From a paper:
Rab GTPases play a crucial role in vesicular trafficking through shuttling between cytosol and membranes, a process that is controlled by several regulatory proteins. Another translocated effector protein LidA is also involved in the recruitment of early secretory vesicles to the LCV. Here, we present the crystal structures of LidA (residues 224-559) in complex with a GDP-bound Rab1 mutant (S25N; residues 1-176) and LidA (residues 188-449) in complex with GTP-bound Rab1 (residues 1-176).
To understand the underlying molecular mechanisms, we solved the crystal structure of LidA (residues 188-449) in complex with the Rab1(WT; residues 1-191) at 2.2 Å. The structure of the complex is highly similar to that of LidA(224-559)-Rab1(S25N) with an r.m.s.d of 0.678 Å for Rab1; 1.496 Å for LidA, respectively. As anticipated, GTP is well defined in the crystal structure and its interactions with Rab1 are conserved in other active Rabs. The hydrogen bonding interactions between the γ phosphate group of GTP with Thr43 and Gly69, from switch I and switch II of Rab1 respectively, are highly conserved among Rab proteins and important for stabilizing their active state. Our structural analyses suggest that LidA utilizes a similar mechanism to GTP for maintaining Rab1 in the active conformation. The GTP-Rab1-LidA structure shows truncation of the middle and the ring fingers does not disrupt Rab1-LidA complex, so that the thumb or the index fingers, though necessary, may not be sufficient to release Rab1. In the structure of GTP-Rab1-LidA we can see even the middle and the ring fingers are truncated, LidA can still holds Rab1. Deletion of the switch-stabilizing structural elements would be expected to disfavor LidA interaction with the GDP-bound Rab1 as compared to the GTP-bound Rab1. In support of the structure-based prediction, the assay showed that the LidA fragment exhibited a higher binding affinity (0.43 µM) to the GTP-bound Rab1 than to the GDP-bound Rab1 (2.4 µM).
Residue numbers in the entry:
A (entry chain B): 257 to 448
B (entry chain A): 6 to 176
């Protein structure tokens, strides 16, 4: 699986922001209809989370975040990564206890149970979210591939030569085969 | 294969209401009872003649099943008209027309044309959605409305012609 390129990340974030803005207008328009308003809010929350997940990959591509393994040592690629952390963060680990905290602050949290518990929580949440981002990344990548097929299925089918149209027809089959895989990816995501 | 107009249409609505059968009746003049759920989209092209003008229609038939509606925003791009289909023998499919319409609002162009189709009107004794209740709804939103039978071909040609006529006059 090739990662999403920066152009792909930007194109998705742009579509999600646009969709988010439209959901907001719609909530305003249906105010008073508690069923539709509730469903629109559920959609908007979902789009917002996907946007935030794309922003993490954006930060990673621009150096505001760095990929690291479970111990917090730097790694090259996303497939190798266990967390993406900020410039000012570090991991502390011992015998299966992992802490994510601000760089230099181990002295400050060492004797503080609330800060300890927070650092463990942040580590685990960060690990799980990176797993979510990887899965969404694959879904986004696959979806962008199917989208660019539509543009192409179109002109091909426009043509009258039984060659380019019979092509379009096999392109449509392939497109639909991808939709089967995309749906199954969406299923796993929901489990995680 | 020259034309004076070129319109992109979508069919949307619940699984099993007859979107694909409407597509196949209109574009291929065929009907079959064998069924496979539409996995993503199907696409047919057909030309009609309206007010002396040749209209090439690009018709996209979408999946009713939510698990296959991953890239719907992409199907709406450049759509001139959307046909919302329900099954006249199935109340839930009609109840869901409200949500389908809200999907149009969300993904389609602001000025997109809409058409409500109640399919399977050949099933006269099985019909549970009254014509007047359907048409009152359509009318309440300025949406044209027809009842069709993909199986017997009733109103199928007329439906696409009515859609093409709505779009032609807003150009
Ligand atoms: N009696 C009658 N049955 C019909 C008519 N149209 C469709 N059906 C039946 O309804 C079934 C569903 O038709 P489809 O067009 O495949 O339904 P769909 O909306 O495309 O469903 P999905 O692809 O799952 O979204 C068909 O297999 C037919 O048996 C009709 O005009 N009359
Ligand atoms: Mg179908």
């Amino acid at each position: 699986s090739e990662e999403l390129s920066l152009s792909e990340i930007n194109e998705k974030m742009k579509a999600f922001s646009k969709d988010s803005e439209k959901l907001t207008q719609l909530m305003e328009k249906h105010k008073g209809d508690e069923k539709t308003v509730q469903s629109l809010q559920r959609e908007h929350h979902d789009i917002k989370a996907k946007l935030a997940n794309l922003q993490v990959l954006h930060d990673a591509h621009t150096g505001k975040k760095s990929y690291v393994n479970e111990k917090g040592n730097p790694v090259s690629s996303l497939k190798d990564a266990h967390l993406a952390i900020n410039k000012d963060q570090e991991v502390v680990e011992h015998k299966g206890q992992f802490y994510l905290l601000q760089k230099g602050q181990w002295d400050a949290i060492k004797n503080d149970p609330a800060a300890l518990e927070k650092a463990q929580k942040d580590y685990s949440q960060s690990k799980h979210d990176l797993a979510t981002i990887k899965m969404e990344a694959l879904i986004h990548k696959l979806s962008l591939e199917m989208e660019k097929q539509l543009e192409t299925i179109n002109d091909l089918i426009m043509s009258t030569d039984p060659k380019e149209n019979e092509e379009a027809t096999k392109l449509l089959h392939k497109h639909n085969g991808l939709n089967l895989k995309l749906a199954n990816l969406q299923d796993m995501l929901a489990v995680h | 294969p020259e034309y004076d107009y070129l319109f992109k249409l979508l069919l949307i609505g619940d699984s099993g209401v007859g979107k694909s059968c409407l597509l196949l009746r209109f574009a291929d003049d065929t009907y079959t009872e064998s069924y496979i759920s539409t996995i993503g989209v199907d696409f047919k092209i057909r030309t009609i003649e309206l007010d002396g003008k040749t209209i090439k229609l690009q018709i996209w038939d979408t999946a009713g099943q939510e698990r296959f509606r991953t890239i719907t925003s992409s199907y709406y791009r450049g759509a001139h008209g959307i046909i919302v289909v329900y099954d006249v023998t199935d109340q839930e499919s009609f109840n869901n027309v409200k949500q389908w319409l809200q999907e149009i609002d969300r993904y389609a162009s602001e000025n997109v044309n809409k058409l409500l189709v109640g399919n399977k009107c050949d099933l006269t004794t099985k019909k549970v959605v009254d014509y007047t209740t359907a048409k009152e709804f359509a009318d309440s939103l300025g949406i044209p409305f027809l009842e069709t039978s993909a199986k017997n071909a009733t109103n199928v040609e007329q439906s696409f012609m009515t859609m093409a006529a709505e779009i032609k006059k807003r150009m």
